[PDB]
Design a protein around this nucleic acid. Structure first.
Ligand code: DCP
Ligand code: SF4
Ligand code: CA
Lengths: 124, 49, 1283
DNA sequence: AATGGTAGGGGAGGG
DNA sequence: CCCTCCCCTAC
C-alpha cells in the first residue's frame, strides 16, 4: 500500500534492529558468558550529550547484549534511560524511572558484570 | 473633488459655471439646476432653485 | 549581440510525426524508421519583449545500463550486440505493452564510456546508451528494466530519475529564465501572426531589424502545408540541436579516468553563480561601497575520532585480506590498465552530436596618625573578588517589590530550592558586625515632647522642570496579469460555479515589467449587462469610473470570449489571483466547464492544439490548475510560504504588509449593492472595492518580490520558473548535481523504490544537548557554526564519488554501501594507504589529494555566494531597509539550498538517490566536532564557562558575572580558537549574546539578544515558545511577552503578579477585544483518520460545510474559532464556537475560566517554575444596579444627585465611544464610497471584516447599547426623574 | 502525483 | 496515568 510516514519509522526501527544484529554477528571476539550478556533483557536509550558519546556507547550496548532504542516512542518498552543532564520538567515527567549516568555502561563493561543502578543513579 | 456634481438616483453629471462656484454646498440637499449642456459631459449652471 | 536570444520561460514536450527536420533513422537499426519522435516546445520572449514559441527537434531522452560485453571487442561485434539487445528490448517492451519494424518506443542503443558516480571508480566503464522515443514512459521502462522483465538478469539502470527537460537542459547547458543562443532558426508559416491585431500593434523597428538580419524569406521560412502554426504567439520558430550555441562553452575535463590529480598532471564550477556575484557587486557598488575580500586564518588541526584505533585495525585487516600474494607493490602510475584501446568508444558528451538530424591640600592636623594603605585597589578588587570564588558582578535575582507577596513559604520546583527575598526594608537583614547581627532586645523607652523629621527626600526642582518641559531596453522579467471576479449570489450562500453567474471581472496587468508599451490603459472592467435591463446603466458606470475604460457585453459567453481574446493579445507570462481555486481563474474555468461547456483552458493556453488529467499534488501544494505556456501561482499560498501571518486573508495580509486597511463586505451586501436601479454611490463602492482588491494584490506581489526572487532562483539553479515553487528541493539538488557532474563524464545511478526501502537505516543522529531549566541572569554566549554540514562536505571530502566503503566487511567479492553493491580492485586499499580518510562511523573516504569531489565544488560555490551576500548585508546599516530584507531573503534561500543539497542524502523516504552511509558519517562527524568544541571550551582554565545548552551546531556558553563587556571578547576568542582547532572550511562565528536568557527545554528558549556591543536597545528573541507559535491566541502571546519583558527588565515579580491579576480580572469581567482570544489552526479535511480524531477547527469546518457546501477551505488553511462557555464535562470540540456565530450570538459568552486556565497557566508556569514560583496561586487568588450588597429600581440608597450623575457619565462615555467608532468606520469606508455624506455611513456599518479590531469594538458597543443593562439604567433614570 | 532528512514539545480524547 | 493523533517549531 502507500508508504505514508508512520510505517516509515517502523521500517527504520526494523532496519536498525537488523543492522545491530548484523554488527553483533560480525563482532565475535567477545567472550562467552562474560562481557556479552551483561545487559541481557535490557533496553537503553541515550538522551542528550554523553561523555562517551553515542555511536560508541551504542557498540558497547549492542555487543554486550540487549537492544538499543533510538526513539523513545513508548515509555513501557524501556528499562534504563541514560542522560547526563535533565531539566526540571523532564525530571518531573520521568519520575519513578531508572535514569543513570552514562558511565554506568562503561563501568559494567570494564567490571564484566552488571552493576546496580542505585549508586549510579542520576538523582543526587 | 474640486467640482460640484449632481445626482438624482439616475446618473451623475458635472456642473460648471460661476453661479454655482461661489456658493457653499453640503451633500444631502437638493436644488434646481438650470442651464445649457456644455461641450463635454458637463452641465452649465445659469440659475438655481 | 549577433545571436538570436530567447528567454526560456516555460518548457513542454509533445509527440509528433517525424519530419525532415527530425532524425528518421537510427544508428543501431538503420533499416527501421520511427513511428513517432519527441519534440520540445519552448515559450520564450525576445529581448525586445515580444513572445516567441520555440520548437526543439532531435532531443531524445536516454538512459544508461551496465555493458554485458568486454573491452577487447574489434568495433564490429559491438554493433551486432547492440542491434541484438535493441531488438530484444523492443520485442519485450512491445509484448509487455500488449522482428517486424517501425520502431515506436525504443529509438537507438549505443556503447559509451563513463565513470560511475555511486562509489569510487577510477577505470573506464562501458555503458549502454538506450534512447527512448516517448519521454512519458521513461519511469515505466526503468521499472521494467530494474525488475528484469526484459532480460533474465536484474540489470541496474543509470540516469533514469532525471527528468527529460532537466536532462536536456543539463546536456545543452540550458538555464531556466535565461537566454538561449542559436546561430540560425527556421521560421514558421507567418512571420507575424495576427489573431486580431497582434501583427499590427506589436510591430516595431527592432523586430524589423531582427527579422531582416536573421531571415531572408527564401530559406528560413518553412512551407505552410507541412509546418502549420501551433502556438498562439506573434512569432514561432523551429531550431535544431546544432543551431543552439548555448553549448560548446562547457569545460569538459577527463581527469577521473586515472589518478591524474594525484600525479599532478593538468573555482567557479557553476556558471550561474558568476552572474549572481556580478549582479550583487554591481548592486553594492551603487552605494559607493568598498571592494570584496576575506582574510583567512591558519588552522592547526592534527583529527582522530573516538574509535580511530579500531577503525585503523579493521582497515589494516581489510588491506591484508584484499591484497595480492607478494608481487610488485602497486603504484599510482601503473595501477590502471594502460593500452586498453578505449579511444574507440566515445564520451557521453561526444555521443550527443550523433543521431542528430544533420540538416543540409587639606592638612591632616597638628598631630595625626596615618593608617596602613588599603590592601586592594580600584582595579584589583574585582579580580581578587573573582579569584576568591564569588562572581565579579552580582546580578539581582528576581524579587518582590512588596513583602506581602512573599507568602512565607518555601519556593522550590522539582527538588531544587530557590531563595527569593524582597528589597523592602521589612525583610532586609540588619547589618552585622563580625558575622553576628545586632538588634535591640529591650522594649523602646519613648520620652515626652519629642520632635521628628521626615526621611524620604522630595522630588528635585530639576526633575519637575524636565518633566514639565517634555509634557535597460532588454526584457529580463516576466509579464504579469491579475484577475478577480464578482458573483451575484442568492441570499447568503457565497458564489457557486453551478447556479451563480459571473457579473464583473477586473484585470490589471503589472505595468512595471510589461514591455512593448502598446495602446492600453493597463486596467479594464468587464461587466455583463443585457439590453433588456435598465437603460443608462453603462453611462452611469462610465461616469462613476471616468478613468478606467469599461467594456460591456450582452452575455457571459461573449464576455468570456472577449477576456480570452484580451489574454491572447496581451499574452501574459504569469496569471495570478489571491484564490485561483474557488475564485478568480478557477471559478471561470469551472463555469465554462459546467454550464457553458467551453474548454477555456485550451483557449487561454499558448498553443491552439496538442493541449490530460488532474493533479492532486498541484491542488494541495500550489498551482492546482495548469495552463500550457503560462505559469499560475496561488498568491495566498505564496504569502503563507513567505510571511508567517495568522489569518492569510486579503484584508489581513494587506494590513500586515502594505499597512492598508480594507473593509470587507458580505456577499449578500455585494449582491444587494450591485442590483439595478441602485444609487451611483453603491456602484462606485463595489467598483472601488474590486479595484482596491486587485491593486492591493498587485502591490503585495511587488513588495514581496516573489517574481524577482523566483526568477533569480531559477537562473541560479537552472530549472524553469514553474519548478521553483511547484517541485521540491530534490529537483534543484538533482539539477545542480547533474550540471556539475556532466563535465566529468560521470554516470548517475538511479535506484528503484525497493532499493531505497531496503537501504540501511540512519542510526546516527545530530546532537541535541538537554538544557538546564533555570533563569540565567549572567550573560550567555551562544556560538553557532555557519553552514556546518556544507563545511564538513568541503573539508572532509564527503560525496558520492569519494566513497571506498564501510571500514568493516570490506572484501574483494561483494560489499554493501548505500543502495548498491560493487567490487573493489585487487590492491586499491594498498595503493591508497595514505590518501584516505576514515569517517567516525567507520566509512573510508578518499582524500582530497587523490580525488576532488564535485559536491565539494558546488557547496564551496554556494557558500562563497552566501558569504558575499552576508557581507553585503552587514556592510549596509539602516541605509535601505528593503535592500537588507531582500539580501536576507536571498541568503536564507542560499542556506536552504545548501541544506537541501545535504538532505539529498538520508532521504530514506521519497528519495531518488539516497545514501545512508554518507549522511550518517556527516551527522556523526558533526556531532564529534561539536563534542570536541565543547571539550576545548571547558578545558581552558582562563574561563570557567560551562556549556549548558547545545543545538546541532549551536553552543550555549554561560559566562557568570562577566559584566557583558568582556563577554564579547571572550566569545570572539572562543570562536577563533574553535575555528583554529577545526578544519579550514569549518568556521565558527560569535553570532549574538544572551544577557537575560531563560532556558526552558530543548528547542525552546527566550531571551534578549545583543548582536553588537554598539547596540543600545536589545531585540526580543524567542524560539519555540508560545509567543512565536501560532497554535495559541494573540492575547496569550502579548501577555507572555509583557511578562517576560517585565521580568528581564525590572526583575520584580510583584509587578508581574499585579499585571497578571489585572489581566485575569479583565478577562473574567469581559472587557476584552474578543479578537485576540481566537485560535488559528490549519485543518486538512482529507488527512484525518476519523471524525473522533479530527481537530477542533475540523468541527467548525464541517459545521460550515453542512449549511453550505461551497465553504470548503483550501488545504492547510487556518480556520478561526472561539470557545464559548459550556456545561460541566462538555468536550472542547463540542462547543467550537465560530467567530461569525459567536458575534451573532445574542447570549454567547466566552469561557473565561477555560481560557484563563488552559491558555495561561501552563505556559506561564513553564516560563516561571524555573524561578521557583507558580502562576496558579496568583490566578486562584483573584440584585442591584450598583455594587449595597443587595436591595423595582434595584437601588437601596436613593442618592439621586449622584446616581443620575453616574448614569449620565456612563451613558455619555458609551455614546462618545460609539460616535468615535462610527466616524472612524465612515472615514475608512470613504476609500470605496468616495463620499462623506449619507449612504456612506450605511455602507460603513455594512462592513463586517473580522481582521480589524474596530469592527469588534463597534459590535461590543452596539451590544452594550442594546443590552438589558442599558434598559435598566434608563428605567432607573426615569424613576429617579419622576419626582 | 508528487513528496529531503533529523529531532522535540504540547494539548485533546480515550484508556 | 499513559498512549495516540494533531499541531507546531527548531536544526
Ligand atoms: N532544514 C534544515 C536546517 C538545518 N539542517 C542541518 C544542516 C545545517 O548545516 C545544520 C545547521 O543549520 P543552521 O540552520 O543552524 O544553519 P547553517 O549551518 O545552514 O548556517 P548558518 O549558521 O550560517 O545559518 O543543520 C538541515 O539538515 N535541515
Ligand atoms: S471595521 Fe470600520 S474600520 Fe475596520 S475596516 Fe470595517 S470599516 Fe474600516
Ligand atoms: Ca548553522
Amino acid at each position: 500500500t502507500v508508504y505514508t510516514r508512520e510505517a516509515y519509522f517502523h521500517e527504520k526501527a526494523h532496519g536498525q534492529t537488523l543492522q545491530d544484529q548484523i554488527l553483533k554477528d560480525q563482532y565475535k571476539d567477545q567472550i562467552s558468558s562474560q562481557s556479552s550478556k551483561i545487559f541481557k533483557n535490557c533496553v537503553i536509550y541515550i538522551n542528550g550529550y554523553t561523555k562517551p558519546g553515542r555511536l560508541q556507547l551504542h557498540e558497547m550496548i549492542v555487543l554486550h547484549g540487549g537492544k538499543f532504542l533510538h526513539y523513545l516512542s513508548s515509555k513501557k518498552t524501556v528499562t534504563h534511560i541514560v542522560a547526563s543532564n535533565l531539566p526540571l520538567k523532564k525530571r518531573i515527567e520521568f519520575a519513578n524511572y531508572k535514569v543513570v549516568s552514562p558511565d554506568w555502561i562503561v563501568d559494567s563493561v570494564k567490571e564484566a558484570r552488571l552493576l546496580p543502578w542505585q549508586n549510579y543513579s542520576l538523582t543526587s | 473633488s474640486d467640482e460640484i456634481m449632481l445626482e438624482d438616483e439616475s446618473g451623475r453629471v458635472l456642473l460648471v459655471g460661476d453661479f454655482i462656484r461661489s456658493t457653499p454646498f453640503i451633500t444631502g440637499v437638493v436644488v434646481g439646476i438650470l442651464g445649457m449642456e456644455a461641450e463635454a459631459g458637463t452641465f452649465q449652471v445659469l440659475d438655481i432653485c | 549581440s549577433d545571436y538570436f536570444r530567447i528567454q526560456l520561460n516555460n518548457q513542454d514536450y509533445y509527440m509528433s510525426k517525424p519530419t525532415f527536420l527530425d532524425p528518421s533513422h537510427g544508428e543501431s537499426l538503420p533499416l527501421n524508421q520511427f513511428s513517432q519522435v519527441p519534440n520540445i516546445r519552448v515559450f520564450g520572449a525576445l529581448p525586445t519583449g515580444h513572445q516567441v514559441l520555440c520548437h526543439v527537434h532531435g532531443i531524445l531522452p536516454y538512459m544508461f545500463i551496465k555493458y554485458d560485453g568486454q573491452i577487447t571487442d574489434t568495433s564490429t561485434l559491438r554493433h551486432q550486440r547492440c542491434a541484438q539487445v535493441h531488438k530484444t528490448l523492443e520485442v519485450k517492451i512491445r509484448a509487455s505493452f500488449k522482428k517486424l519494424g517501425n520502431l515506436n518506443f525504443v529509438a537507438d542503443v549505443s556503447v559509451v564510456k563513463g565513470i560511475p558516480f555511486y562509489g569510487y571508480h577510477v577505470g573506464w566503464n562501458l555503458f549502454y546508451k538506450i534512447s527512448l522515443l516517448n519521454p512519458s514512459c521513461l519511469s515505466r521502462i526503468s521499472e521494467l528494466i530494474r525488475d528484469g522483465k526484459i532480460f533474465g538478469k536484474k540489470f541496474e539502470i543509470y540516469e533514469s530519475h532525471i527528468p527529460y527537460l532537466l536532462q536536456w537542459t543539463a546536456d545543452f547547458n540550458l538555464f531556466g529564465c535565461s537566454w538561449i543562443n542559436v546561430d540560425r532558426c527556421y521560421f514558421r508559416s507567418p512571420v507575424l501572426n495576427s489573431i486580431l491585431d497582434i501583427d499590427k500593434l506589436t510591430i516595431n523597428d527592432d523586430l524589423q531589424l531582427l527579422l531582416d538580419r536573421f531571415c531572408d524569406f527564401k530559406c528560413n521560412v518553412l512551407s505552410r502545408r507541412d509546418f502549420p502554426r501551433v502556438g498562439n504567439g506573434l512569432i514561432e520558430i523551429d531550431i535544431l540541436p546544432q543551431f543552439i550555441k548555448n553549448r560548446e562553452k562547457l569545460q569538459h575535463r577527463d581527469i577521473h579516468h586515472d589518478f591524474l590529480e594525484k600525479l599532478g598532471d593538468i573555482k567557479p564550477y557553476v556558471s550561474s553563480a558568476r552572474d549572481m556575484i556580478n549582479e550583487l557587486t554591481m548592486q553594492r557598488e551603487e552605494l559607493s561601497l568598498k571592494e570584496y575580500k576575506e582574510p583567512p586564518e591558519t588552522k592547526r588541526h592534527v583529527h582522530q575520532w573516538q574509535s580511530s584505533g579500531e577503525f585503523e585495525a579493521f582497515y589494516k585487516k581489510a588491506q591484508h585480506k584484499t591484497s595480492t600474494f607478494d608481487g610488485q607493490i602497486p603504484n599510482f602510475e601503473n595501477f590502471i590498465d594502460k593500452n586498453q584501446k578505449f579511444s574507440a568508444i566515445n564520451t557521453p558528451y561526444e555521443a550527443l552530436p550523433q543521431l542528430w538530424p544533420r540538416l543540409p591640600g587639606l592638612r591632616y592636623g597638628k598631630r595625626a596618625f596615618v593608617y596602613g594603605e588599603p590592601p586592594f585597589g580600584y582595579q584589583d578588587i574585582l579580580n581578587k573578588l573573582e579569584d576568591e570564588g564569588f562572581p565579579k558582578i552580582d546580578y539581582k535575582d528576581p524579587f518582590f517589590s512588596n513583602p506581602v507577596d512573599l507568602e512565607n513559604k518555601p519556593y522550590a520546583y522539582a527538588g531544587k530550592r530557590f531563595e527569593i527575598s524582597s528589597t523592602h526594608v521589612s525583610t532586609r537583614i540588619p547589618v552585622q558586625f563580625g558575622g553576628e547581627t545586632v538588634s535591640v532586645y529591650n522594649k523602646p523607652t519613648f520620652d515626652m515632647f519629642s520632635s521628628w523629621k521626615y526621611a524620604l527626600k522630595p522630588p528635585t526642582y530639576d526633575a519637575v522642570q524636565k518633566w514639565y518641559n517634555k509634557v535597460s531596453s532588454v526584457h529580463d522579467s516576466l509579464t504579469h496579469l491579475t484577475l478577480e471576479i464578482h458573483a451575484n449570489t442568492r441570499s447568503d450562500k457565497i458564489p457557486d460555479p453551478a447556479i451563480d453567474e459571473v457579473s464583473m471581472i477586473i484585470w490589471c496587468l503589472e505595468e512595471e515589467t510589461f514591455p512593448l508599451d502598446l495602446d492600453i490603459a493597463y486596467e479594464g472592467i468587464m461587466i455583463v449587462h443585457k439590453a433588456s435591463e435598465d437603460s443608462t446603466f453603462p453611462t452611469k458606470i462610465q461616469h462613476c469610473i471616468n478613468e478606467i475604460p469599461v467594456m460591456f457585453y450582452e452575455s457571459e459567453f461573449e464576455m468570456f470570449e472577449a477576456l480570452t481574446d484580451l489574454v491572447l493579445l496581451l499574452d501574459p507570462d504569469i496569471l495570478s489571483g489571491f484564490e485561483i481555486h474557488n475564485f478568480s481563474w478557477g471559478y471561470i474555468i469551472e463555469r465554462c466547464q459546467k454550464i457553458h461547456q467551453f474548454d477555456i483552458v485550451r483557449e487561454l493556453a499558448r498553443v491552439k492544439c496538442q493541449i490530460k488529467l488532474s493533479d492532486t499534488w498541484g491542488y494541495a501544494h500550489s498551482s492546482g490548475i495548469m495552463i500550457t505556456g503560462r505559469h499560475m501561482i496561488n498568491i495566498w499560498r505564496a504569502l503563507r510560504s513567505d510571511v508567517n501571518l495568522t489569518q492569510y486573508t486579503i484584508e489581513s495580509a494587506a494590513f500586515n504588509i502594505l499597512h492598508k486597511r480594507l473593509p470587507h463586505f458580505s456577499f449578500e451586501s455585494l449582491t444587494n449593492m450591485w442590483n439595478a436601479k441602485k444609487s451611483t454611490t453603491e456602484l462606485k463602492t463595489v467598483l472601488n472595492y474590486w479595484l482596491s482588491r486587485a491593486q492591493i494584490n498587485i502591490q503585495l506581489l511587488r513588495k514581496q518580490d516573489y517574481i524577482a526572487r523566483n526568477i533569480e532562483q531559477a537562473r541560479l539553479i537552472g530549472i524553469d520558473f514553474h519548478s521553483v515553487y511547484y517541485r521540491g528541493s530534490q529537483f534543484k539538488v538533482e539539477s545542480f548535481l547533474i550540471r556539475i557532474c556532466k563535465s566529468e563524464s560521470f554516470i548517475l545511478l538511479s535506484p528503484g523504490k525497493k532499493d531505497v526501502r531496503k537501504q540501511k537505516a540512519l542510526e546516527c543522529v545530530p546532537l541535541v544537548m538537554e538544557p538546564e531549566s533555570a533563569f540565567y541572569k549572567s550573560p550567555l554566549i551562544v556560538l553557532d557554526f555557519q553552514s556546518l554540514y556544507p563545511s564538513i562536505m568541503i573539508g572532509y571530502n564527503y560525496c558520492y564519488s569519494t566513497m571506498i566503503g564501510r571500514v568493516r566487511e570490506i572484501n574483494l567479492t561483494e560489499n554493501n554501501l548505500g543502495v548498491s553493491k560493487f567490487s573493489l580492485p585487487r590492491n586499491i586499499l594498498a595503493l591508497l594507504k595514505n590518501d584516505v580518510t576514515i569517517a567516525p562511523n567507520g566509512v573510508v573516504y578518499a582524500k582530497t589529494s587523490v580525488r576532488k569531489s564535485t559536491l565539494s565544488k558546488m557547496l564551496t560555490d554556494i557558500l562563497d555566494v552566501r558569504v558575499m551576500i552576508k557581507k553585503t548585508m552587514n556592510e549596509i546599516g539602516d541605509d535601505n531597509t528593503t535592500l537588507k530584507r531582500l539580501l536576507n531573503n536571498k541568503q536564507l534561500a542560499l542556506k536552504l539550498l545548501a541544506n537541501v543539497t545535504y538532505g539529498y542524502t538520508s532521504a530514506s523516504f521519497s528519495g531518488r538517490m539516497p545514501c545512508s552511509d554518507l549522511a550518517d558519517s556527516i551527522v556523526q562527524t558533526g556531532r564529534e566536532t561539536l563534542e570536541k568544541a565543547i571539550d576545548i571550551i571547558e578545558k581552558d582554565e582562563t574561563w570557567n564557562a560551562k556549556v549548558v545548552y547545545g543545538d546541532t551546531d549551536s553552543l550555549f556558553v554561560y559566562l557568570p558575572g562577566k559584566t557583558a563587556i568582556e563577554a564579547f571578547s571572550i566569545g570572539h576568542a572562543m570562536a577563533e580558537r574553535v575555528t583554529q582547532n577545526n578544519p579550514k572550511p569549518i568556521f565558527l562565528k560569535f553570532e549574538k549574546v544572551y544577557h537575560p536568557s531563560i532556558l526552558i527545554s530543548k528547542k525552546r528558549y527566550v531571551g534578549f539578544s545583543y548582536e553588537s556591543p554598539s547596540q543600545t536597545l536589545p531585540i526580543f528573541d524567542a524560539k519555540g515558545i508560545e509567543t512565536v507559535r501560532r497554535d495559541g491566541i494573540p492575547a496569550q502571546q502579548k501577555i507572555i511577552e509583557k511578562c517576560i519583558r517585565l521580568l528581564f527588565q525590572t526583575k520584580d515579580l510583584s509587578k508581574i503578579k499585579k499585571y497578571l491579576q489585572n489581566e485575569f480580572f479583565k478577562i473574567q469581567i469581559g472587557k476584552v477585544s474578543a479578537q485576540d482570544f481566537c485560535f488559528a489552526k490549519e485543518v486538512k479535511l482529507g488527512a484525518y483518520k476519523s471524525e473522533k480524531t479530527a481537530p477542533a477547527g475540523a468541527v467548525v469546518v464541517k459545521r460550515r460545510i453542512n449549511e453550505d457546501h461551497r465553504a470548503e477551505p483550501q488545504y492547510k488553511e487556518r480556520i478561526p474559532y472561539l470557545v464559548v462557555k459550556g456545561k460541566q464535562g462538555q468536550l472542547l470540540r463540542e462547543r467550537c464556537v465560530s467567530p461569525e456565530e459567536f458575534l451573532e450570538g445574542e447570549n454567547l459568552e466566552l469561557d473565561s475560566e477555560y481560557y484563563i486556565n488552559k491558555i495561561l497557566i501552563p505556559p506561564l508556569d513553564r516560563l516561571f517554575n524555573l524561578i521557583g514560583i507558580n502562576v496558579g496561586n496568583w490566578a486562584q487568588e483573584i440584585c442591584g444596579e450598583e455594587l449595597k450588597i443587595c436591595s423595582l429600581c434595584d437601588d437601596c440608597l436613593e442618592k439621586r444627585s449622584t446616581t443620575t450623575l453616574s448614569f449620565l457619565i456612563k451613558k455619555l462615555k458609551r455614546q462618545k465611544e460609539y460616535q468615535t467608532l462610527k466616524t472612524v468606520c465612515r472615514t475608512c469606508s470613504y476609500r470605496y464610497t468616495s463620499d462623506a455624506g449619507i449612504e456612506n455611513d450605511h455602507i460603513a456599518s455594512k462592513c463586517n471584516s473580522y481582521d480589524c479590531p474596530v469592527f469588534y469594538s463597534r459590535v461590543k458597543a452596539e451590544r452594550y447599547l442594546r443590552d438589558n443593562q442599558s434598559v435598566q439604567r434608563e428605567e432607573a433614570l426615569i424613576s429617579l426623574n419622576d419626582w
